[PDB]
Amino acid sequence: KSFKDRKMIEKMQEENRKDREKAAAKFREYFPNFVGEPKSKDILKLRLYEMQHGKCLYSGKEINLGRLNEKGYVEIDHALPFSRTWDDSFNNKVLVLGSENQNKGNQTPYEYFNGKDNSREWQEFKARVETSRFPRSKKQRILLQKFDE
């Protein structure tokens, strides 16, 4: 309704603009040579990098931040495969090395890492997820065992 609502609106909208520009300036600070403007997926890669402590979630290997935008180095993977979940939420998006995202196919992390037999790779993966800066609903989603079925 009122004019003071209008003023609060542009107050609140300024904080939204300033934050998106803050993330944009940071991206080009990190990558001056990045041609063009960072899209949402580019910001997501960087965000995932920070939350995963600079490690590929599948291998545990260190990700070279310099090659983050290198076409074919890091990929954003759907943990629970999209074909069985249709889950394109942020909670189902993780950052992995392109090399380590070649033989997972339509498996869940639980299936891929042989969590049924509590394998070493499963234990290391699970430890990597629980110690990351993911929300606790994201960890639960990633670490799901059974489905509907």
């Binding site: 803050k22 600070e29 990558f31 001056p32 910001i43 920070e50 490690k55 260190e62 800066r133």
Partner: protein
């Protein structure tokens, strides 16, 4: 490239009570480097958010932004008896190869000292 982390440790002296205005200033200096990219670093104008907290700020050192940020901290830290600020510098390639457990604690221990005000 030249990626570094400025490991910042902020604690309360006890030498002097900390104002609410001093808290709002420091939290504002920190949040200037905070976005959706690293929301976990966000600071509030409260004691729990600033006292005994480690914050690892990612920088490209070929940019002058790290120097700006550190200068703002040092300038603040000298006009506020109630808050101590310590700063270290560490290679990002060494930072990610540290453990995740107590990482910022170990970064300060193995990082190059910048200042301790």
């Amino acid at each position: 490239m030249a990626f570094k982390r400025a490991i910042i440790f902020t604690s309360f002296n006890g030498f002097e009570k900390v104002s609410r205005t001093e808290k709002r200033r420091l939290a504002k200096i920190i949040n200037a480097r905070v976005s959706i990219i690293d929301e976990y670093l966000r600071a509030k104008d409260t004691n729990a958010s600033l006292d005994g907290q480690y914050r690892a700020f990612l920088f490209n050192d070929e940019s002058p932004a790290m120097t700006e940020f550190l200068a703002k901290l040092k300038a603040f830290a000298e006009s506020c008896t109630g808050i101590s600020i310590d700063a270290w510098e560490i290679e990002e390639s060494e930072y990610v190869r540290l453990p995740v457990e107590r990482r910022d604690f170990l970064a300060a221990a193995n990082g190059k000292e910048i200042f301790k005000i």
